[PDB]
Amino acid sequence: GSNQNNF
Ligand SMILES: [Zn+2]
């Protein structure tokens, strides 16, 4: 799957 991190 795809992964996104929004700090
Ligand atoms: Zn993946």
Contacts 24+ apart (CB under 8 A), 1-4: none
CA of 5 to the centre of ligand 1 (A): 13
Q: How far apart are alpha carbons 2 and 6 in whole angstroms?
A: 14
Q: How far apart are alpha carbons 3 and 5 in whole angstroms?
A: 7
User: How big is the chain, counted in residues?
Assistant: 7
Q: What is the DSSP letter of 5?
A: -
DSSP string across 1-7: -------
CA of 7 to the centre of ligand 1 (A): 19
Q: How was this structure determined?
A: electron diffraction
CA of 6 to the centre of ligand 1 (A): 17
Q: How far apart are alpha carbons 7 and 1 in whole angstroms?
A: 20
Q: Which amino acid is at 4?
A: Q
Q: How far apart are alpha carbons 6 and 1 in whole angstroms?
A: 17
Q: Which amino acid is at 6?
A: N
